[PDB]
C-alpha cells in the first residue's frame, strides 16, 4: 500500500545511491599511470531502469574534482576535493516524482611502490525530491534530506602482463541520511509515519582483469570484472501509524550481482568514444538498467 511505496522509495533511492556510488578508476581517475599530481578528474554517467510493479526511473549524475600533491617515499598520497550533481525522475502505478542531489566533499588517493591502489572520498549532499502520491491520501509534497556519505575502496593490480593483469578490488560506502516524518491529517486521518536519522552502508567486492594498451592506434581501456554487492548497513527503518494501529519496517541487506563494460576506447586527444552495459535482470524482480554508445570525431 502506501507504506509499501516507501520501501520502493528507498529501493529506488538505493539504486540512485547505487548509481551515485561508482568506481574509483573511473569517477576519481586511475590511481596509477597519472603523472599530474596537481590537477582535476571527473566522470559523468546517465542511465535508467525499472522494477516489478511498473516502478521506473531515469537518472544522470556528473561529478568532478581536483587534487594536489607531489612525490613521496614510494607512496602516492594525494588529497583534494570534489563536487557532484545528479538528477533523477521516477514514475510508478499510483505515484510519480522528480528529484535532484548535489553534494561536495573531499578525497584522498594512495598508490604505493609495490603496485597497490587505494581511493577514499566523502561528500555532504542535500538531496531534494518532489513527488505526488495519492496512496494514504497525502497528496503532493517536496522534501530535502542531507546525506553525509563517506566511501573507501582498495585494490591490488599486480603486473601479470604489461598489457593484461588481474586486479582484486573491494569498495564500501557508509552514509548518514535522516528519515522523514509526515501525517496525512489534511485528508482527515493522521496516519503519521516517522523515521529518525539513518546510518546505512553498502559495499561491493569485485575481482577484475584490465588491459594496458597504448600506441594511440588502440589506446583502449578494456577491463572486465565480476563483483558481489552487500548492503553492509540498511537502517532505513520507518514506523507508520493508522487508526487501527501502528506498524514498523526497515531496510534490509543485499546480495546483488553485476557485470562489466565492453570497449570504452579512444583514438587520440582530439576524439573520444565509449560503450556501456545495461544489466537488465527481469528474472529477479523485473529489474533493468540502461546504457549508451557514442563517439566523437573533430577535425
Amino acid at each position: 500500500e502506501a507504506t509499501r511505496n516507501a520501501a520502493a522509495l528507498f529501493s529506488v533511492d538505493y539504486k540512485a545511491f547505487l548509481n551515485e556510488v561508482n568506481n574509483l578508476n573511473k569517477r576519481m581517475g586511475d590511481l596509477r599511470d597519472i603523472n599530474g599530481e596537481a590537477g582535476a578528474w571527473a566522470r559523468i554517467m546517465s542511465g535508467t531502469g525499472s522494477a516489478s510493479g511498473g516502478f521506473s526511473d531515469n537518472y544522470t549524475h556528473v561529478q568532478v574534482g581536483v587534487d594536489k600533491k607531489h612525490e613521496l617515499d614510494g607512496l602516492d598520497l594525494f588529497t583534494g576535493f570534489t563536487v557532484t550533481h545528479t538528477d533523477s525522475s521516477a514514475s510508478a502505478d499510483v505515484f510519480s516524482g522528480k528529484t535532484k542531489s548535489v553534494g561536495a566533499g573531499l578525497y584522498a588517493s594512495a598508490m604505493f611502490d609495490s603496485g597497490a591502489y587505494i581511493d577514499l572520498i566523502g561528500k555532504y549532499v542535500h538531496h531534494d525530491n518532489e513527488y505526488t502520491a495519492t496512496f494514504a491520501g497525502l497528496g503532493t509534497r517536496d522534501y530535502s534530506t542531507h546525506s553525509w556519505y563517506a566511501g573507501a575502496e582498495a585494490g591490488y593490480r599486480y603486473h601479470v602482463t604489461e598489457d593484461a593483469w588481474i586486479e582484486p578490488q573491494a569498495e564500501l560506502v557508509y552514509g548518514s541520511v535522516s528519515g522523514k516524518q509526515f501525517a496525512w491529517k489534511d485528508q482527515g486521518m493522521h496516519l503519521s509515519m516517522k523515521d529518525k536519522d539513518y546510518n546505512p552502508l553498502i559495499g561491493r567486492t569485485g575481482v577484475d582483469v584490465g588491459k594496458s594498451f597504448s600506441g594511440k592506434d588502440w589506446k583502449v581501456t578494456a577491463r572486465a570484472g565480476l563483483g558481489y554487492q552487500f548492503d553492509l548497513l540498511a537502517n532505513g527503518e520507518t514506523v507508520l501509524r493508522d487508526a487501527s494501529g501502528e506498524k514498523r519496517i526497515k531496510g534490509e541487506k543485499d546480495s546483488r550481482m553485476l557485470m562489466s563494460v565492453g570497449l570504452n576506447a579512444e583514438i587520440r586527444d582530439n576524439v573520444r568514444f565509449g560503450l556501456e552495459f545495461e544489466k537488465s535482470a527481469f528474472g529477479k524482480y523485473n529489474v533493468d538498467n540502461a546504457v549508451n554508445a557514442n563517439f566523437r570525431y573533430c577535425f
Partner: protein
C-alpha cells in the same frame, strides 16, 4: 580559449490572439507585464570538441509555472 561573464537577463513573451473576458478565472496570457528576470555567472570554453558552455544563475523573478534548471550546460 576561455571566457567568463557575469550576466543579468530579462525576457518576456505574449500572444495577441487572446481574450480575457472570455476567461475571467483563467489568467491572461496577453499582458506584456510578466517580465521574467535572472542573474548569475556563465562560462565558455573552446575545448578540442567544440564550444562548451556552462552557466549557473538564479531566476530573481518568475511567474506561473516557470520550472527552472539552475545550472545549464550545452555545446555550440
Amino acid at each position: 580559449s576561455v571566457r567568463t561573464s557575469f550576466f543579468w537577463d530579462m525576457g518576456t513573451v505574449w500572444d495577441t490572439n487572446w481574450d480575457s473576458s472570455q476567461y475571467s478565472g483563467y489568467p491572461d496570457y496577453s499582458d506584456p507585464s510578466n517580465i521574467r528576470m535572472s542573474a548569475g555567472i556563465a562560462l565558455q570554453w573552446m575545448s578540442p570538441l567544440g564550444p562548451l558552455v556552462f552557466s549557473y544563475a538564479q531566476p530573481f523573478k518568475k511567474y506561473d509555472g516557470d520550472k527552472a534548471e539552475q545550472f545549464q550546460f550545452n555545446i555550440g
